Design a protein around this ligand. Structure first.
Ligand code: SAH
Ligand code: SAH
Lengths: 225, 230
């Protein structure tokens, strides 16, 4: 709903609106994704909500296939021009579509694809089970990066979302995370290590690696079967 | 000189001042450092120009030692608080000193230390051979990240330095790279694949892996005569 707005994806994904304490989250998920690709021998990387290809360099340096899924057409156009200039036109592609449409009805990318859900993508879903169930039913390994329920995490997010200029930004503290809502249909929540592992268990996704810094949690998961 | 100014490191290293085209450079530099440490069995990471510990997460995920060197007091204070809260007080450490001072007269970190020169740090040295010569003693390996001489790179750099707000920003075109100067005492040059490999060869640093995207070049080097054991 929110990311169907003209400058909805831009305002959220532009580095200009990023506090300095966001970078640790982005670095942790990058290294987790990179190593998960190598160990599980994933010849493809499917970044759900790629924007301008935030995980293209991972797929590039492993000489793996890439697919960037996002609703922002302007950001996907940057990624298309980037793929051409880098010379990955043969082993890189982009689609302008809802990530749930791709995961449900889309075609396979390579033989073994890793599905990245970067920068608290799972937090922007009210019923995230629908997305995690489509991954589980796809029989593909996945990486899930979310914000933490620490005091420092919530502070960085509050700053981060205010720079983006989310109309009617309201903080809602819960036991298993902190939820930020906006008048423009903006929804985003953080996760506790326990809640995230519990949610993934409910959707039949086994945790093999689990990294957690001050700001973020990142987990590599395998579908049961 | 420029980074001894109170808000010299702050303006250059604040994410808000980064174009979106810069993140690929940082990502490539991170993945190569992460993999170099693993392959070369480095038990310690020494990030020169760490700011707020920009490579701390690499040392964290490898269970390796960490030392952040930077002139910014406020940025090192953020790193100390982060090291404390993430429970790395026994593994991680920080110093507020000139990287050349540390590299010449500083104590070693662990048995096998990899020295990271991140985000075109080597570019901000008029006489970079001074910095490269000092690495031989205290390190078994090093990662050198640096901007490219490409048209797209110079465009991103011009955009990047303008957002940082460098006083009297001037572009000086060369065959080797592109030099950006400021009236603050700011200096920052890019390198060509050839000129970088040539400079590292002159200082006795052998290139092992060499990655290059549209904007940047990143190389893993070994000092000639250093230990290559486990
Ligand atoms: N249903 C959907 N289909 C496609 N892209 C989506 C999407 N939902 C989100 N995205 C994309 O996901 C990317 C990152 S979402 C970032 C979330 C934010 N950091 C937070 O804390 O909540 C954006 O570029 C956005 O366009
Ligand atoms: N001589 C020195 N001693 C200590 N830190 C230094 C230093 N020179 C630079 N630094 C630190 O190195 C960090 C990165 S410098 C980044 C260079 C910039 N990206 C460019 O393109 O030119 C800064 O935080 C700065 O404080």
């Amino acid at each position: 709903a929110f990311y169907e707005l003209e400058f909805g994806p831009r305002t959220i994904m532009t580095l200009a609106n990023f506090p300095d304490d966001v970078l640790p989250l982005l670095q942790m998920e990058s290294l987790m994704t990179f190593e998960a690709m190598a160990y599980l021998r994933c010849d493809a990387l499917v970044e759900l909500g790629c924007y301008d290809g935030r995980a293209l360099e991972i797929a590039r340096l492993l000489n793996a296939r890439y697919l960037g899924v996002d609703l922002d057409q302007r950001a996907i156009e940057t990624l298309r021009t980037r793929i051409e200039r880098e010379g990955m036109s043969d082993r890189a592609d982009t689609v302008v579509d809802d990530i749930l449409n791709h995961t449900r009805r889309g075609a396979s990318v390579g033989s073994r694809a890793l599905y990245l859900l970067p920068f608290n993508l799972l937090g922007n879903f009210r019923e995230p089970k629908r997305l995690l169930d489509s991954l589980a039913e796809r029989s593909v390994a996945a990486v899930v990066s979310v914000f933490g329920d620490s005091a420092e995490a919530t502070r960085v997010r509050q700053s981060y979302y205010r720079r983006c200029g989310v109309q009617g930004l309201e903080l809602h503290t819960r036991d298993d995370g902190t939820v930020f809502t906006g008048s423009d249909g903006f929804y985003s929540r953080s996760y506790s290590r326990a809640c995230l592992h519990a949610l993934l268990a409910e959707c039949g996704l086994t945790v093999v690696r689990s990294a957690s810094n001050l700001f973020a949690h990142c987990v590599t998961v395998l579908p049961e079967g």
